[PDB]
Write a protein that binds this ligand. Structure first.
Ligand SMILES: *[C@@](O)(CO)[C@H](C[C@@H]1CCNC1=O)NC(=O)[C@H](CC(C)C)NC(=O)c1cc2c(OC)cccc2[nH]1
Ligand SMILES: *[C@@](O)(CO)[C@H](C[C@@H]1CCNC1=O)NC(=O)[C@H](CC(C)C)NC(=O)c1cc2c(OC)cccc2[nH]1
Lengths: 299, 298
């Protein structure tokens, strides 16, 4: 079981670079709009304490350099939506895929296409942590890189990169410019909330073990969802939502193990430990495979 | 610090589906040639012990159905090079990238674009292990998926997928059709040689952990190269060469930890264990990052 990204080609064809003054980052070119982080309009000094509505009044269309490779796309309009800038360009991208903009929940995974100067560099899978950070791999010039899932050739864009925290994890927005978590696009040291283990994904991992014949941890007990949530919080595990219970439905049906029965097995694991045993070869419980990832790989 | 694959778009544009009778797998369409595993010509019966030259002479161009998304490509010629079939088509692939075929050495990494029915499905990083297997994620229908590296828009293809061993590791060929390792394209259970750990990669990864602010495994000791290799061979690690020491130079300079100091640290980890602790999130010593992988990403 390994972390697999989606093929990145459909997103590669949408990556551009956006420069204002000397400040350069990446943008996403879909139809005749380029989406990028709004702090491109800031000078290094401005980012310390920017007033974005005031910085944007000073900008005109002709202040924006949008390039696909070294080919300039002329900007014919601009607007600000939350923390993203939308630049209307005179050319509709012929490589635009079928797409949607979606806001994901904590625990969900997505592929990140890390980009520099408009040029894709690498691709890897990330999980949104419950403190709304991702454990990415980003260097200077990576802002505007995007995260996505692909469902039957439709690209659901869910992340645009803005920030590296002092702890080394990363934070960003959806494609409507709304940050995940309590972060702000200022050049300031911000701290994330305490992380928690992603319970719904640990349960997915346990189903994956069962599918593969590794089922020693299945016990004879069950639990209510409220009782489980109150115990889980004492082990720094996230409480389950109704949506979590329902996305475990397919794996529960496939194995015949009720969701709440698996919760009872996890509860026993948390209270008593692995006792030196392993699950899928590992002494650690994995929390960055979603139920979707598990079926995506298992079947 | 993450296992990071190359962007796969240049390879996606080359994946096609190849069908012979009841048998289907993936092919790689470059210019006017489709490369695919030769066992596509085998029925279930043939695959137990196939005489590939005999089976191929009995095939016609029309026996090969090649589909690129929706379009069907007319096969106008075919030849076999070792375990790889080369289907000449009457259409050149307009999306062919600048490319090369290379054969990689153990320890080197590459990106895998896992495909099913000629449609790309996922991308992830693999390393060619010392026993010439790879730890991949491949299901039924994945044969003909390829591995590659990308250097300034040139795709260097190094792997075509053929088989999953009983242990769950994977085996395949270069794009000349020569297997990595002692494996053969017959429907049999095959074991690999002993899996020595790629030492220079474990050391590169320990440097990655320091560059990302983790030092708990460092120590005040040093070791000679030979004394380290004695311990390495005892734990079935590959002996470290002076070329390996040289390749680790940049990470040592960037970090200020001499290579032999990091070897003393790895020696301690091999002798004491990790004592329940973790490095870069891993409970195990990671051996699938090369020194270049660490430099490029950091
Ligand atoms: C984008 O590339 C910027 O356009 C960049 C990406 C990060 C650089 C290193 N890795 C990354 O992911 N973003 C930034 O530099 C942002 C810019 C803001 C939103 C205006 N700033 C930070 O990520 C940032 C600032 C500070 C800081 O200050 C002082 C102190 C500590 C951490 C920190 N991160
Ligand atoms: C291909 O896709 C075939 O076109 C398939 C890929 C594997 C299936 C499951 N995961 C994979 O990576 N490859 C095979 O099925 C090959 C075909 C050979 C080369 C003709 N066979 C095996 O991988 C294989 C056969 C046997 C076996 O026999 C008996 C016993 C144990 C393991 C095993 N693997």
């Amino acid at each position: 079981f390994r972390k697999m990204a989606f093929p990145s080609g459909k997103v590669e064809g949408c990556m551009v670079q956006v420069t204002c003054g000397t400040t350069t980052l990446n943008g996403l070119w879909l139809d005749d709009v380029v989406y990028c982080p709004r702090h491109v309009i800031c000078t290094s000094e401005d980012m310390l304490n920017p007033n974005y509505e005031d910085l944007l009044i000073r900008k005109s269309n002709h202040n924006f350099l949008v390039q696909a490779g070294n080919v300039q796309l002329r900007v014919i309009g601009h607007s600000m939506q939350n923390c993203v800038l939308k630049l209307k360009v005179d050319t509709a991208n012929p490589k635009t895929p079928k797409y949607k903009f979606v806001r994901i929940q904590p625990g969900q995974t997505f592929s990140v296409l890390a980009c520099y100067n408009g040029s894709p560099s690498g691709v890897y899978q990330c999980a949104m942590r419950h403190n709304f950070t991702i454990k990415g791999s980003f260097l200077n010039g990576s802002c505007g890189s995007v995260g996505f899932n692909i469902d039957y050739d439709c690209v659901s864009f869910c992340y645009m990169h803005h920030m590296e925290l002092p702890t080394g994890v990363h934070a960003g927005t959806d494609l409507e410019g709304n940050f995940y978590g309590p972060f702000v696009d200022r050049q300031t040291a911000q701290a994330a909330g305490t992380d928690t283990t992603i319970t719904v994904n640990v349960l997915a991992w346990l189903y994956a073990a069962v599918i593969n014949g590794d089922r020693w941890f299945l016990n004879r007990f069950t639990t209510t969802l409220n009782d489980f949530n109150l115990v889980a919080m004492k082990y720094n595990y996230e409480p389950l939502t109704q949506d979590h219970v329902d996305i475990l439905g397919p794996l529960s049906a496939q194995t015949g193990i009720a969701v709440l029965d698996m919760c009872a097995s996890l509860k026993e694991l948390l209270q008593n430990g692995m006792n030196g045993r392993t699950i899928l070869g590992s002494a650690l419980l994995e929390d960055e495979f979603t139920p979707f990832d598990v079926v995506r790989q298992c079947s």
